[PDB]
C-alpha cells in the first residue's frame, strides 16, 4: 500500500538499521526506492535513493546478514 515519494537528505548509520526492502516503480508508486527499517520502534521507515553511494554501501553491509525481501 504505502510507498516512498522522496529520498533521505541525510546519511544514516548501520547501527540504527535492522534491515532493508526495495520499492520498484508501480501505479501507486512512481519512483524506485530503498526502505531502511529501524532497530528502534520509536523510529519510522526511511526512504532513500538507490543510486546514492552511501545507500548502496549500507545495503551491501546489511546483505552480509540478509533478511527476506519482497517477492519480485
UniProtKB/Swiss-Prot annotation:
Transmembrane segments: none annotated. It is found in: Secreted. GO terms for molecular function: CCR chemokine receptor binding; CCR7 chemokine receptor binding; chemokine activity; chemokine receptor binding. Disulfide bonds join 3-29, 4-47. Keywords: Chemotaxis, Cytokine, Disulfide bond, Inflammatory response, Secreted, Signal. One of its GO terms (biological process) is inflammatory response. Highly expressed in high endothelial venules of lymph nodes, spleen and appendix. Intermediate levels found in small intestine, thyroid gland and trachea. Low level expression in thymus, bone marrow, liver, and pancreas. Also found in tonsil, fetal heart and fetal spleen. It comes from the Eukaryota. One of its GO terms (cellular component) is extracellular region. Inhibits hemopoiesis and stimulates chemotaxis. Chemotactic in vitro for thymocytes and activated T-cells, but not for B-cells, macrophages, or neutrophils. Shows preferential activity towards naive T-cells. May play a role in mediating homing of lymphocytes to secondary lymphoid organs. Binds to atypical chemokine receptor ACKR4 and mediates the recruitment of beta-arrestin (ARRB1/2) to ACKR4. Belongs to the intercrine beta (chemokine CC) family. Monomer. Binds to CCR7. Interacts with PDPN; relocalizes PDPN to the basolateral membrane. Interacts with TNFAIP6 (via Link domain). Interacts with GPR174. This is C-C motif chemokine 21. It comes from Homo sapiens. The lineage of its organism: Eukaryota, Metazoa, Chordata, Craniata, Vertebrata. The chain holds residues 29 to 100 of 134 of the full protein.
